[PDB]
Design a protein around this nucleic acid. Structure first.
Lengths: 479, 53
DNA sequence: TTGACTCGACATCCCGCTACAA
DNA sequence: ATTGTAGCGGATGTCGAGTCA
């Protein structure tokens, strides 16, 4: 009955790790490639590809009465450049194998079993001759635009293996595999319009179009077959000056529902790790353009709204179904649903969507005490009914200060309960160490065992005594 | 702490042959277990390391 | 075409006392 | 004898598969 195609949590955690590892590698490859693009030797040769007429078209004069017409001229320039690049790029290869498209966990495992060293010269020579796969082709096109002094980002859709794929056997359909894989590009270009203050999307090699993305993009894969090998999750923009920015929100129609489920950024550790990576790769400092962009993203983030299906309201950042409200949460007084969802596949069946910012988290008395807070019905399991209280019913707990002799106030068991810094007396400190208790007892100074989690993890002693304890622990072998 | 032969193969794959990333990453991650918890704690270090080389 | 629903086996979060042995 | 030592998880969530409208 059950062929049970599911793996162990061990494999789960490994896949998550390898996903991070592959992503980081991808993003480094981008950074380096973006370097190779800035190559000064290349620009000077590439300049002669562009007639003065086209160059002038690329830098039109400000038109004060109607800025649009300047943008209009700019667009014509970009199209003529794309044309001569079609002309510059003679022989366009096939991706060897799957190129930089996403590989399957199975493909990886098996890739161990079964490469032209390239480096920087070979890239340059290729781009100058016009020989390479579509990735090189695009990269060259961005180089060219850059050699003309336009602010031209290289965009990369990173396709690491999917770490939410829990399956043991992960097998793909063979039909039209390559044509469906190449239906949308892995690399492309963005360009900053100073007149309209927006980034223009450009795909000169694969789809050969130019778009001003608002809510929909021709480049974002659609249907199911095209999305197996191209799964849009991390769209990274590198600019001339070694900026690095996550622009996913531009290209994802449902970023906060659909896409957020497939990025590492859905839990908090993830978000913080990703930001660490962006900062590692972001070597310039914030410009005003960054702000025009952030405002666009904010507005996009507020225009997504309730999704059109129930599955998209699981673990949504802003939105939650009435039915997914935990037993221990309540609705903040005088708030209500922010929206409705027509439920696909039952006539008239509708669900209540609340904004998550209108939901309050409740905790019992002990639970608060364990966060260092004290006070200014449900079913538990013997049978008991447990009352829960909100965060604003409560107040920090300030524990009594230690005496002159450094005496600490203890509990019935002769310890002091320290589950949170608040619960350390003001004049005291917590020292967590298997021997901290051995130490303090050996010195026979006044202390109190710290319960940090019947687990005695350490000591609470007066601050004047700190230097002494730190020394005694260090000498524990001699006690 | 990593060898210089692996950092060499890695600088070269990452820079000029990313098609071959997949199997190399299988290999190297299998030869340096601690790399896991490293990558989780301090990615920006590993970055800078790959940039110098 | 797609989403809703159910079901299978994992996780994840949150919540010392009796008896024997040398 | 007596002290040291050793033996006994529910509400909720996630994803895969299969099924239905």
């Amino acid at each position: 009955r059950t062929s049970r195609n599911c793996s162990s949590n061990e494999e789960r955690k490994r896949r998550k790790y390898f996903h991070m590892l592959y992503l980081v590698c991808l993003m480094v490859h981008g950074f380096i490639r973006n370097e190779w693009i800035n190559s000064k030797r290349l620009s000077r040769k590439l300049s002669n590809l562009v007639p003065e007429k086209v160059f002038e078209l690329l830098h039109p004069q400000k038109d004060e009465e109607l800025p649009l017409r300047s943008t209009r001229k700019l667009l014509d320039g970009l199209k003529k450049c794309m044309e001569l690049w079609q002309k510059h790029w003679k022989i366009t290869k096939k991706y060897d194998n799957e190129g930089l498209y996403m590989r399957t966990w199975k493909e990886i495992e098996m890739s161990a079993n079964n490469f032209k060293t390239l480096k920087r010269s070979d890239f340059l020579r290729a781009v100058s001759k016009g020989h390479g796969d579509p990735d090189i082709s695009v990269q060259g096109f961005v180089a060219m635009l850059r050699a003309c002094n336009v602010n031209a980002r290289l965009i990369m859709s990173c396709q690491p293996p999917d770490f939410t794929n829990m399956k043991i056997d992960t097998s793909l359909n063979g039909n039209n595999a390559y044509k469906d894989m190449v239906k949308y590009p892995i690399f492309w270009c963005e360009v900053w319009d100073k007149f309209s203050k927006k980034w223009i999307t450009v795909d000169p090699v694969n789809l050969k179009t130019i778009e001003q993305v608002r809510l929909h993009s021709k480049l974002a894969p659609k249907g199911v077959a095209c999305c197996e090998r191209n799964m849009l999750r991390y769209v990274i923009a590198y600019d001339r000056k070694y900026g690095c920015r996550d622009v996913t929100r531009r290209y994802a129609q449902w970023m906060n529902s659909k896409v957020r489920k497939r990025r590492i950024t859905k839990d908090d550790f993830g978000e913080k790790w990703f930001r660490k990576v962006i900062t590692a790769l972001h070597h310039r400092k914030r410009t005003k353009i960054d702000d025009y962009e952030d405002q666009y993203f904010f507005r996009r983030d507020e225009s997504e709204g309730i999704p059109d299906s129930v599955q998209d309201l699981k673990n949504h950042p802003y939105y939650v179904l009435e039915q997914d409200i935990k037993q221990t949460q309540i609705v903040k007084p005088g708030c209500k649903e922010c929206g409705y969802l027509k439920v696909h596949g039952k006539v008239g069946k509708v669900l209540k969507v609340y904004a998550k910012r209108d939901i309050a988290d409740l905790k019992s008395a002990r639970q608060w005490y364990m966060n260092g807070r004290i006070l200014k019905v449900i079913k538990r399991t013997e049978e008991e009914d447990e009352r829960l209280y909100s965060f604003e019913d409560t107040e920090l707990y300030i524990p009594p200060l230690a005496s002159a002799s450094g005496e600490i106030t203890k509990n019935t068991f002769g310890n002091i309960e320290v589950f949170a810094p608040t619960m350390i007396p003001g004049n005291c400190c917590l020292v967590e160490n298997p021997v901290a208790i051995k130490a303090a007892r050996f010195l026979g100074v006044e202390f109190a065992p710290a319960v940090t989690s019947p687990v005695l993890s350490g000591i609470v002693v007066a601050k004047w005594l700190r230097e002494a304890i730190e020394t005694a622990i260090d000498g524990i072998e001699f006690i | 702490g990593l060898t210089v032969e692996d950092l060499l193969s890695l600088r070269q794959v990452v820079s000029g042959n990313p098609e071959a990333l997949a199997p190399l990453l299988e290999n190297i991650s299998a030869r340096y277990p601690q790399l896991r918890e490293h990558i989780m704690a301090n990615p920006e270090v590993f970055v800078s390391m790959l940039l110098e080389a």
